[PDB]
């Protein structure tokens, strides 16, 4: 069960199934960041930096790296 932290969501602290990127460059699990924006916050959780967009963009290359790491272990 040796899970690299780069693959963990800063809020869930678990492996990311649907990693998305916000305007600051930080990556989060979609359900987690969606709840954070639903709770009224307009801030990057990790950096407190205020966001310039609400667009969540899937981080496909990370989805690839996680999926590769999943099939090995």
């Amino acid at each position: 069960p040796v899970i690299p932290d780069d693959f963990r969501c800063p809020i869930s602290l678990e492996l990311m199934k649907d990693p998305v990127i916000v305007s600051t460059g930080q990556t989060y699990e979609r359900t987690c960041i969606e709840k954070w924006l639903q709770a009224g916050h307009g801030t990057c959780p990790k950096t407190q930096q205020t966001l310039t967009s609400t667009v969540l963009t899937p981080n496909y290359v990370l989805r690839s790296l996680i999926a590769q790491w999943c099939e090995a272990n």
């Binding site: 932290d5 959780p45 990790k46």
Partner: protein, 52 residues
Amino acid sequence: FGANTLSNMGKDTILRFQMFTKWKANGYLPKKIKDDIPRSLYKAYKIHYRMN
């Protein structure tokens, strides 16, 4: 440390992260606060300190 605030962290992940950012800011560490909080919540804070 917040009677019902602490249980709401086993439930809500958003609140739990907010509180984890506060515990980190006051440099509470992994082992200094262990045995003052539940085992599940400790194993989580151990990961939050390591990467946040």
